[PDB]
Design a protein around this ligand. Sequence first.
Ligand SMILES: Cc1cc(OCCCc2c(C(=O)Nc3cccc(C(=O)O)c3)[nH]c3c(-c4c(C)nn(C)c4C)c(Cl)ccc23)cc(C)c1Cl
Length: 151
Amino acid sequence: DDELYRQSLEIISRYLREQATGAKDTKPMGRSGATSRKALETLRRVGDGVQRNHETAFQGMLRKLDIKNEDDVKSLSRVMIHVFSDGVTNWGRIVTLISFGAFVAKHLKTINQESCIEPLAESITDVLVRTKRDWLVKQRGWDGFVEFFHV
Ligand SMILES: Cc1cc(OCCCc2c(C(=O)Nc3cccc(C(=O)O)c3)[nH]c3c(-c4c(C)nn(C)c4C)c(Cl)ccc23)cc(C)c1Cl
């Protein structure tokens, strides 16, 4: 019933799963998929920049998260909510959110827990769309996201 969440999960889920592994999801994309393909391209060009530019902090935070299993995923949500929700809302901070999601997803594919990439995505999507919905609606959602990072 919730269209922006579902779009957002399709974008975020694919960015993370494709980052943790080698290849893209070749499923055809749901409603608003030309924007989702574009937003996904944007997350690849800017997400990788953000990940290489913050590696040491990402390595620190990923290492003190000590993620074993899928039940660890949703105590993780507490530290990410704590770090993401209370300050300034803008597109850079949301892209940093999704890029650390890709970082942790890669780690989880290393420790043979790729089955936890999707719950992670869901949690990230749910945290972004819940606490930021009004902002996302007034900034036009993913079309605004693509236009903001356009080159
Ligand atoms: C998937 C997931 C996503 C999570 O959050 C994403 C949120 C974004 C974020 C920020 C951030 O928000 N910066 C920022 C920019 C402008 C203003 C304010 C403000 O305070 O108002 C903040 N910092 C992060 C950092 C970071 C950096 C970089 N430096 N330091 C000290 C830290 C803690 C690390 Cl290691 C990972 C993510 C982030 C968190 C987790 C745990 C997961 Cl699993």
